[PDB]
Amino acid sequence: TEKEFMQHARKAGLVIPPEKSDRSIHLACTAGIFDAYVPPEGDARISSLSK
Amino acid sequence: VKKGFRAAFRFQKELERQRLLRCPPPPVRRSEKPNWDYHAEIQAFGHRLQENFSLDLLKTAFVNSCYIKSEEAKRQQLGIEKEAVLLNLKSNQELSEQGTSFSQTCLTQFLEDEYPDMPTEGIKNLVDFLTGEEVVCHVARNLAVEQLTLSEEFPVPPAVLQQTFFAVIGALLQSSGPERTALFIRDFLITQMTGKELFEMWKIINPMGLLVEELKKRNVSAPESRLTRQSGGTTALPLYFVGLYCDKKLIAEGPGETVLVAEEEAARVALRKLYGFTENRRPWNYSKP
Amino acid sequence: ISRKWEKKNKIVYPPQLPGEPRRPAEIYHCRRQIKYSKDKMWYLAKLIRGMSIDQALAQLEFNDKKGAKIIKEVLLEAQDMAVRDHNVEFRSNLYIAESTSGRGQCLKRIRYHGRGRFGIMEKVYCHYFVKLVEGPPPPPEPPKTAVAHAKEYIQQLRSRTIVHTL
Amino acid sequence: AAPKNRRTIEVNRCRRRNPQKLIKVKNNIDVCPECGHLKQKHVLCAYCYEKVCKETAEIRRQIGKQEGGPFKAPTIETVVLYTGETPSEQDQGKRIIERDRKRPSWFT
Amino acid sequence: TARGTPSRFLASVLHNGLGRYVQQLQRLSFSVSRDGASSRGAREFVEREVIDFARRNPGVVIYVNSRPCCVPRVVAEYLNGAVREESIHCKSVEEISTLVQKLADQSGLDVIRIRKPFHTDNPSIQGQWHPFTNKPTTFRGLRPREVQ
Amino acid sequence: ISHGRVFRRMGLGPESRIHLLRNLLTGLVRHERIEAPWARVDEMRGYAEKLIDYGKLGDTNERAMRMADFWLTEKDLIPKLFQVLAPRYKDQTGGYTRMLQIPNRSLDRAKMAVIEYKGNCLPPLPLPRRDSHLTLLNQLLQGLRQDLRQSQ
Amino acid sequence: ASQLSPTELTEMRNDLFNKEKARQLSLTPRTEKIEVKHVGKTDPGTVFVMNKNISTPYSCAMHLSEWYCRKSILALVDGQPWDMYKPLTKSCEIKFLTFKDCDPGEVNKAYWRSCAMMMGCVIERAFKDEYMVNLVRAPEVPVISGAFCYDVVLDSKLDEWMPTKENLRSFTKDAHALIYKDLPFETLEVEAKVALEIFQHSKYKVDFIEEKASQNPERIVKLHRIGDFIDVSEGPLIPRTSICFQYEVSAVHNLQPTQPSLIRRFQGVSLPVHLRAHFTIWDKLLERSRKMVTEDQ
Amino acid sequence: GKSGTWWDEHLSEENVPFIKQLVSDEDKAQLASKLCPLKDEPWPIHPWEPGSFRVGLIALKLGMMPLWTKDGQKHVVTLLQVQDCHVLKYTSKENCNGKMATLSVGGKTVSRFRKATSILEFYRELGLPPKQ
Ligand SMILES: [Mg+2]
Ligand SMILES: [Zn+2]
């Protein structure tokens, strides 16, 4: 008559591999884009071959 | 763990039993189950009916036009040319037409010389019942032509089942004379009339008008309806007895819960007594002449 | 332990044909390990059973039980999940179709009775289940009138046969 | 006294599910004319009562700030005033408690 | 027990005896093990008697699957659609022949309680009994204690 | 058998009942609005009305002084009772101690209520308003009243 | 104007009504978004996103709660009363009204217009088909007066009788049968040309359409429909016909000498479900309704 | 569904004293209308036969009081007051038991706002305020 529950867990992953190790994560992409291509304002007006 | 193998296997088979029982699968054609061979099934269908079919005409009878069009669409969506065999599939249309025409004329001849008093409308309704969709679908399902039917939509919607059943009737008409096909349609359609009252097939609406027209044909003047016996007129479960007297002479007697339903039932009883289709009639003489 | 109510939100039906009915929405939700008995929770789950969601929230905001606030929070988060994710557009257009409660995992304690004797106190826990279906609440089945009873009795008197012969 | 036989689940379901023990549906609930927060008839709306109890707690806080310690209990009536709202000529001898807020549009 | 099992009424499947009689069995699916002491009787049966049984009644189709299996079985499917599967694990030749003959004889209706073993379809001929049979009529249909 | 038996039994005796009502009445005179359970505020309203009557009796009267000395246990509320509340109610006779239910206590689910002396510089309670005169039933009855007064 | 069975007339009227409704519904090609806002008292800052010419204000209430579905009778589209089953047109602001509000006079006028239309619906289908009845109009009487009115001319054979209590009891039973079916007041904004093309026969109705089409510049009339009944009324109505609980038609009166033929003024009284009265107060209000109410000037 | 309701739920503040005054004057006029029964249309008055039974009343127990007799003893009396008593309906002999006819008698007056519908219809056809 002396027993309690188990399984105290959490549902939020974190930044554990920099808490310390000698293996870094090999990514395969980047964050976003380098410098945005701003389109011309009248590209629909310039929808033909050239102008 | 309890060591061993046979109990765990037996429980696994029982789990597969309950798991297949909870969610039953969509049923598949018998031609797509492992134990199947079409030619031997055609020969066994020919031999079990004590008939001598020519197998080419039975194979002609069991194809359908929807099967031909779906097979051609399947051969064209893949691009494989099947112009070798599919141009001689020769669907069962003309055999089905010969079958329905011959079965109609022979059933009308049977029911005409069996019943001399039946009007043409009544024998027309009877042959339309016996060659109708329901009972030929029943006979077709219990004579395994649905397993031999080549079509789409595996439940085989009953119009095309009727098509194949009259097709194999026409195949018997081609392969053997009118006597053999007459014996076949006797043995597998006239037996479906057993135990059924006449107005369970004809389904007339106003019987008293039909009775007074029939008695005007027989030159007996007018059926006047007298109440004969009743037991309980004020309760909620009455019982009446109406007798139809033509010229102070009884012709019928009908019971019912009210006088209208009992008079209409006496009209039905008089109509069956006049037409020679009663429960006391001669049962059909299934024999060999 | 078995969690099957939570997986019922991840069913996906094939897309309907135009000549078909609407197939109204179904939303399953539950809250596990409630510090409450299962029978007192069952009385509230029977109170709710058939009513619409707004009438259920009304009857639970004024019911003086510990389970009432818990079921009101569960119903509010189920309504919010129904409006956001499960493609229900009218918030009041929901009725409870299934609502029940099951026994959860328990613990055990001593009672220290009035000699060198004792009992086994159990710290009870329970679950709550709920299922919402969009559309109006279906009407209650009316009590069958005298003509229905007379029709059933006359039909039973019609259906009898000559027994134990031919 | 002891049980002689164990009650079944049929007798138990016949006991604990009859209409004498079930929770009865009530129909006294309507909406409040202000703020619509589902009041009951014959009972003050909980939201509006929470409003006036919060403002009463604030006014009592300022009153306790004005009365030093315990046992003062002034011998003149009181009035409260919001921002702006100069003391009218009837409210001369009355004690003035001004917090800092607009006068809300239900306290007149 | 009869209350714990379903029941049917006695009936023929498609009115056999009126017109022509037809063999109600379609297929017989034999699975015999190549090696194995459990299927020695079925092995000898497939050697010596199944050809004479197939020539005995040509309506039935017989398949011999010849598959490695610990329990040999025979699968019988009837005309109306029922499927009855029975095992021939460790039986003689005579018992297997009697089993397949009994499978060939019966019709595909379920082996349950038969429930009033006769099926007259016109049970009455002179007219079924109603309470006004054997009760005479009286003049002008007067009930008892009637005035006119 | 309690036919015609007023004064429900509150505390652990009669004396603790009167001490409980004394503390509630002292809190009412001090704070001018009180929330407490329903039977207690019913008894305390019934006592508070006649306490206001004894305050209306006057300051120099020694009997009212003895009653105010007994019932107010903070001794600063006696100048308040004789110089604020009783001059405020000089025109009215007994219409005060307005009592209304507030829904339920959170912990033990007891029936709570709120009483207040009238006057009361605190913000007002959301009182239950009678239905307006411009609605359908009231306008039909107003037509009936005008039509009958014209007919008379 | 032609010979007509009484059934095929309401058949062609309802078929023309459904044709005009299908035209109005097919006028918009797609689902365009309008931003209706709530400047009511209870839930401020609420903004719905609705389908143009599709979404009723009942469908704007169905986002909020069920109490808005039960107790909102008449809505307010930026200045004006809108009945609960009329599709919105422009991006606007909305606010609901109930019976127990402070100034409910607009919903009182709408309720008595609804009850007059129900009295027209019950009066056109109880008379003998050999006899002729023509719905004249519904006079907008102020609600302080003892009853709502509807004017109907009868056949020339009917210039001498007056109905007993039993005929009015049959009228009330048919009206309660109309209440028993939970029917919607389905409204429609129809151009005056096709509006008069619907009726085309009853000259009083044509004169009423020309009257109410004369005052507005765009020749737009307000039609409403209760099942297969069709009538013209000024302004909005109540959403459902089950909102009425107590309903009773009081009596009829003859006001002859203004015209050679005879007009008959049918009178009745009602109250909703939300404001039902006790039986004594109700029979008092019923007893006042038997007197003649005259407010047309 | 339908909520509960009572007579003065939806009245305004001005209409309640008018409604109370109206129904009080109405049923006081109703009670004063039946004050002359012999000139209205009375049923035929019969003389006393030796085997007859008359109707009773319905009274109200006010209290008790002493009362002395001429020979000196003390008796105690109970004061029964008949406030408003009216015969309500007459059921004939063949309609109740076939033995003796019945007469219904009503007690003290009550409010119309707290009785059932069928009782209110019955008293409205009779023309009296309802009895307790
Ligand atoms: Mg106590
Ligand atoms: Zn509120």
Swiss-Prot record, chain A:
This is Large ribosomal subunit protein mL45. The gene is MRPL45. Belongs to the mitochondrion-specific ribosomal protein mL45 family. The chain holds residues 52 to 102 of 306 of the full protein. Component of the mitochondrial large ribosomal subunit (mt-LSU). Mature mammalian 55S mitochondrial ribosomes consist of a small (28S) and a large (39S) subunit. The 28S small subunit contains a 12S ribosomal RNA (12S mt-rRNA) and 30 different proteins. The 39S large subunit contains a 16S rRNA (16S mt-rRNA), a copy of mitochondrial valine transfer RNA (mt-tRNA(Val)), which plays an integral structural role, and 52 different proteins. Component of the mitochondrial large ribosomal subunit (mt-LSU). Within the mitochondrial ribosomes, required to direct the nascent polypeptide toward the tunnel exit and position the exit at a distance from the membrane surface. It is found in: Mitochondrion.
UniProtKB/Swiss-Prot annotation, chain D:
It comes from the Eukaryota. Residues 86-108 are annotated as: Disordered. One of its GO terms (biological process) is mitochondrial translation. Residues 91-103 have a biased composition (Basic and acidic residues). Zn(2+) binds at C32, C35, C45, C48. Keywords: Mitochondrion, Ribonucleoprotein, Ribosomal protein, Transit peptide. GO terms for molecular function: RNA binding; structural constituent of ribosome. GO terms for cellular component: mitochondrial inner membrane; mitochondrial large ribosomal subunit; mitochondrial matrix; mitochondrial ribosome; mitochondrion. It is found in: Mitochondrion. MRPL32 precursor is processed by the m-AAA protease (composed of AFG3L2 and SPG7), which cleaves the N-terminal transit peptide. Cleavage by the m-AAA protease takes place prior to assembly into the large subunit, an essential step for mitochondrial ribosome (mitoribosome) assembly. Proper processing by the m-AAA protease is dependent on the zinc-binding region within the tightly folded C-terminal domain of MRPL32: zinc-dependent folding halts degradation initiated from the N-terminus and triggers the release of mature MRPL32. Its main location: mitochondrion. Component of the mitochondrial large ribosomal subunit (mt-LSU). The mitochondrial ribosome (mitoribosome) is a large ribonucleoprotein complex responsible for the synthesis of proteins inside mitochondria. This is Large ribosomal subunit protein bL32m. It comes from Homo sapiens. The chain holds residues 79 to 186 of 188 of the full protein.
From Swiss-Prot, chain F:
Keywords: Mitochondrion, Ribonucleoprotein, Ribosomal protein, Transit peptide. This is Large ribosomal subunit protein bL17m. One of its GO terms (biological process) is mitochondrial translation. Belongs to the bacterial ribosomal protein bL17 family. The keyword Mitochondrion applies. It comes from the Eukaryota. One of its GO terms (cellular component) is mitochondrial large ribosomal subunit. Component of the mitochondrial large ribosomal subunit (mt-LSU). Mature mammalian 55S mitochondrial ribosomes consist of a small (28S) and a large (39S) subunit. The 28S small subunit contains a 12S ribosomal RNA (12S mt-rRNA) and 30 different proteins. The 39S large subunit contains a 16S rRNA (16S mt-rRNA), a copy of mitochondrial valine transfer RNA (mt-tRNA(Val)), which plays an integral structural role, and 52 different proteins. Its main location: mitochondrion. Detected in adrenal gland, mammary gland and adipose tissue. The lineage of its organism: Eukaryota, Metazoa, Chordata, Craniata, Vertebrata. It is found in: Mitochondrion. The keyword Metal-binding does not apply. GO terms for molecular function: protein domain specific binding; structural constituent of ribosome.
Curated annotation (Swiss-Prot), chain G:
One of its GO terms (cellular component) is mitochondrial ribosome. Keywords: Acetylation, Leigh syndrome, Mitochondrion, Primary mitochondrial disease, Ribonucleoprotein, Ribosomal protein. The keyword Ribonucleoprotein applies. CDD domains: TGS. Residues 32-98 form the TGS domain. One of its GO terms (molecular function) is nucleotide binding. It is found in: Mitochondrion. Belongs to the mitochondrion-specific ribosomal protein mL39 family. It is linked to Combined oxidative phosphorylation deficiency 59: An autosomal recessive mitochondrial disease presenting with multisystem manifestations of variable severity. The disease spectrum ranges from lethal infantile Leigh syndrome to a milder disorder characterized by hypertrophic cardiomyopathy, lactic acidosis, attention deficit-hyperactivity disorder, and survival into adulthood. Component of the mitochondrial large ribosomal subunit (mt-LSU). Mature mammalian 55S mitochondrial ribosomes consist of a small (28S) and a large (39S) subunit. The 28S small subunit contains a 12S ribosomal RNA (12S mt-rRNA) and 30 different proteins. The 39S large subunit contains a 16S rRNA (16S mt-rRNA), a copy of mitochondrial valine transfer RNA (mt-tRNA(Val)), which plays an integral structural role, and 52 different proteins. This is Large ribosomal subunit protein mL39. The gene is MRPL39.
